[PDB]
Design a protein around this ligand. Sequence first.
Ligand SMILES: CCN(CC)S(=O)(=O)c1cc(Nc2nccc(-c3ccnc(-c4ccc(NC(=O)NC)cc4)c3)n2)ccc1Cl
Ligand SMILES: O=P(O)(O)O[C@H]1[C@H](OP(=O)(O)O)[C@H](OP(=O)(O)O)[C@H](OP(=O)(O)O)[C@@H](OP(=O)(O)O)[C@H]1OP(=O)(O)O
Length: 1286
Amino acid sequence: AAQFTVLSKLRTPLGRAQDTFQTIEGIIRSLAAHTLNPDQDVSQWTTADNDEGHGNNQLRLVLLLQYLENLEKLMYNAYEGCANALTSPPKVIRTFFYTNRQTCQDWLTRIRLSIMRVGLLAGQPAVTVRHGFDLLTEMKTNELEVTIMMVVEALCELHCPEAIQGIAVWSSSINLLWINSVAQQAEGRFEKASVEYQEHLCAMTGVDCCISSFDKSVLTLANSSPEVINYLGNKACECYISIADWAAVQEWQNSIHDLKKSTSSTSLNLKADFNYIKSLSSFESGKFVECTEQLELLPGENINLDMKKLLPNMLSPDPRELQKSIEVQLLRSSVCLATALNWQSITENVVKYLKQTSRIAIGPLRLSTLTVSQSLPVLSTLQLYCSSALENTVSNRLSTEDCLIPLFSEALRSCKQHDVRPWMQALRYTMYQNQLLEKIKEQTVPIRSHLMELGLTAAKFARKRGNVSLATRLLAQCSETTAQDLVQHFKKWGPELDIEKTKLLYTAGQSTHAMEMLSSCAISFCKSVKAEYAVAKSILTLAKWIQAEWKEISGQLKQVYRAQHQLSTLSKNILTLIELPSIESESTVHIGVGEPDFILGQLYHLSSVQAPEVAKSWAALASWAYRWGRKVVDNASXXXXXXXXXXXXXXXXXXXXXXXXXXXXXXXXXXXXXXXXXXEGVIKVWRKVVDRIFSLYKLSCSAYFTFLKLNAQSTDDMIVMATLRLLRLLVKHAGELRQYLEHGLETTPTAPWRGIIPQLFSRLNHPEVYVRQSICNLLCRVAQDSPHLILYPAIVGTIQAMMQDCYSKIVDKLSSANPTMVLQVQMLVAELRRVTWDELWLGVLLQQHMYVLXXXXXXXXXXXXXXXXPHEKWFQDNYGDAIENALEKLKXXXXXXXXXXXXXXXXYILRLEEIAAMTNTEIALPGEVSARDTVTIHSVGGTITILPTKTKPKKLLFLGSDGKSYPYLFKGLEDLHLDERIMQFLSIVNTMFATINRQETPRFHARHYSVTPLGTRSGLIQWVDGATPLFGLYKRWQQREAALQAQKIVPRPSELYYSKIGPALKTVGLSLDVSRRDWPLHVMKAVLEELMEATPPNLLAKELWSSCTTPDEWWRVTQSYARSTAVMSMVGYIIGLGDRHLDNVLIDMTTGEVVHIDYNVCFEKGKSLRVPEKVPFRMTQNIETALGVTGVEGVFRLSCEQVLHIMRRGRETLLTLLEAFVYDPLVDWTASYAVSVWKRVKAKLEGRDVDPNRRMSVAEQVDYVIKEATNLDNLAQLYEGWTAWV
Ligand SMILES: CCN(CC)S(=O)(=O)c1cc(Nc2nccc(-c3ccnc(-c4ccc(NC(=O)NC)cc4)c3)n2)ccc1Cl
Ligand SMILES: O=P(O)(O)O[C@H]1[C@H](OP(=O)(O)O)[C@H](OP(=O)(O)O)[C@H](OP(=O)(O)O)[C@@H](OP(=O)(O)O)[C@H]1OP(=O)(O)O
């Protein structure tokens, strides 16, 4: 319909060009006016004939909004045009829409205000948000406050606090400090939001509008126009209604009435039916007698004592009204059932009523599918489930398990992105059944356990958001306004309830009381029956809390330690907990280990021994032991004395004792030192003393092995770190703890060791004997049940003898199962290496000609001819005179003629048959790191294409078992060993975002491909499809502009830049002959400013907007793009990736993610080029505009801060991986440099990027990096090909 309207010059049968606009404007204005006052009764939009027309009304409104959006997209594409998204319309349509573009823009701007209201009424915040952003952008020159208010409300409905904060910061640069309150409310903090609302209203009105609430200090520690006043009041009322605080609602209403009477506002009025609130309060309180009377006044069908027309007439299409009606119907059915009970007497009608209610409640769910939303409403889903539960309980009388709500504790680890409102309805409908259970004599289902579990989960959710007021109520209800009140009121689900109470007390501020209660709970749990998930959790929480307040609890630990070798409540409680009867000795920790730190180790050890089935305790103990062991080892570089004295039967004794532990080939050095000092039992003494000062590593290794054995339950990032630490221990100190590794590596599984395979292969040349054998055995074992992981590297390395026997043994062990596959893969590798003649001859001739201006040339020619002796035969036959010509000329035009002929013949498409061809192969694809079921190659592409503007890249195509096309790309004469390590690093980094991705709509992921080397110079790089480069948009825009200017090829970036830098330099007094370094800064800045004023910044934003289908999809892709851009920018800044031109950045129109291509200029390599670059990443005008009207102050800044926090928290594993990459004999860094690169990366991660000793914070670092990447002083002095103006 939209296409027909646009293609028909707006001459639809509805009327003329202006008639359609007038009709749409009138309908939109009527809806907008009705939105302000519900008492309007809009014809054909608010009145229906039955329950079927109500859903149709909302459907029609949604369709109208979609039609308007499509119309706008088509008009924009008609007068401006797109690139690779929509086809260009005919010339007549473009010439007609180009002249009448101003009228269309004016009409859209005039109706945008009403469109926002209409979108808000239909429960479609995406439409109003997009329209608001467009309106704000168009207003570049008193309707500014209303627009911000509507956009803020819409964002709050979408649960996007980052966007709200960004808009607040953006608007602060133009009185509007109340936006932060809505931002906080969007996160689920109702108490803080309400308090802030009251404070703002009191400060803006002038009169005290505060109401009774919880302590302001405790609440904070835990977490002038009439329109603004009305909005704040309504928001506060809604906030109180959400937390189900009837008393607070009544107090707020009284305060509002008093304020209105004492201020004569005459414009403030709460838009909330108080009758419904009173009914809800009466129903929840158990007074059904008053509830029925209150319900008798609500509109709709009368209470049950006709079925199709249940909803009342004159109902607005607002989803809130529908939800209220559904809730009223459910309450009516519940009260009717309760009164009838105290079987087909009063059940024939209730069942029908509930059935109709359930059928009507499915409307929102069905509407959500009409658009690409990727999610379902929570309120509607819960209402439907509650209706179904009631329908089942009325017919079963609570006799089956289907009468309960499916909300279990499993949502704790999978529904962390929802507020506490979802559980309010569940608890409201569950308490009713619990109370009704007392009026049933027959056997029923156990609802007490379900009610307790549901209440506990809700309490945890409320506490996590700072809702102390609601959390206290839930805890009191499950257990059946001052800080001391909680302390004096709290101090199968027993352990969970106790832990929740302790957590609530700690969140309230009383940390000492919470810690003491947790210690007592742990003491009582240690003597329980199971004590599996309770003792470990309590000990871990207590240890974490103690670690947080280390400064304020340092004395208690010392006192406990002193008492243990010879006090406050916590001190004695911890002492009793540690001395609990069921490895660590004080003598070993007596050197280099602090007294209070030993308590943490004891706690971890006790938790591990008490709960050996959990992996968290083992990991914590291993980390603590490893850290302290490394510290004591680094800082270290009566029985012993008695043994030495007895074996040596005053200065001599002191010298011997000092030499025995001086700096513990070591045996020879010790013997020589002892002989030179004194002038054999010293060896035994040294061996016994070295083990004591080297015992923490043994415990760390044992704990790590045990933790890994349980993962054959934890995140991948938590396992990779352990594997890396174990490898480092086995590499650095191999002979000191070889006994533990000897049996440890002979029983560990191979599943968690598949993430450090390249490191294992690179560490196959360790100067040892058993270390090499152990690594080889581990790799061989890994080959079994998983041969597609070490197949390619082994065969590649096979084709010093240390790196030869291991490879031979690995290939021999891997070939004992499927020898045919091994031989076929070897043949394929050989063919690929041999398919990397004409090019070699051309290169040799060019090099010889360039170096000509002798014996070297003759030797090179002879060697090339000897090496070169389907396609080879043809080349040899057509160029068989090269040898004869060279021999004749040896005693030189032949070389020039051959080079010219080769160059002329060079100027693509090849064939696989001419350069063998297998089928039904069993060889794995090149790179299957993430593949549950390996896919074997089935065929090869018949033709191979070549790519220009490069050395020699060849694009191919492969087929798998599932008939899927997997293209690749060849790379010869260019080592790709560093790219593999970079990709591995990126994968490890992405693994850290697995936890944060469980409660966030935009996933934190960094797109990357897989690369595999085929020796020393060859290489196969994966091909990523579906991504479009950013340079295409600029090229298309240039072509469109040229075509438009022609009526009334395109220049390259270098030519365009020179056309502007020439005249400027000539006018300033200089010339083009001057060096680029000696160039004025003002000239470059002026040229850049003039160039940016010509390229519009909507090339990328409009592209993404036109590539979508519905507003929800547009919002989702926009958020995903912003998050992806922030993640990529932070990763590039940390690594130091440079040369990020438009051809090295690709955008995915399907999801909006950004992916890089050339990972060559990295590790701060662009600063040493001919034209150094100082910008950390690409923050061009188009990139900034594509992030929204806010820019870099909304989701971009918050995402960058979160990414930096994640990277800084786990920088140990990243540093270890980088160190391993440095000591890699297969990596060619030059193409002490590696040490410098590692030091730079470490400095960047530690926050000391540019500072002598000051450590910049995350916020400061983000601000400095953003400022350094956006200042015009750095973008002007850059390479021409970087395209800094687009
Ligand atoms: C419009 C023209 N294009 C953009 C230039 S494109 O190539 O044709 C194209 C590319 C993709 N995406 C894609 N996917 C996988 C790989 C590559 C790719 C392309 C070129 N070079 C490399 C490369 C080269 C060298 C190194 N290594 C070192 O430099 N030092 C060790 C690493 C990588 C990788 N690109 C999608 C569509 C299109 Cl059309
Ligand atoms: O209340 P819980 O359900 O037991 O959640 C806790 C904890 O919550 P608290 O921060 O309130 O103590 C953290 O939950 P999130 O902050 O991620 O939402 C989480 O990780 P952190 O403690 O590091 O923040 C993790 O604790 P841990 O990682 O130490 O195991 C978890 O504990 P459980 O997973 O054992 O339930």
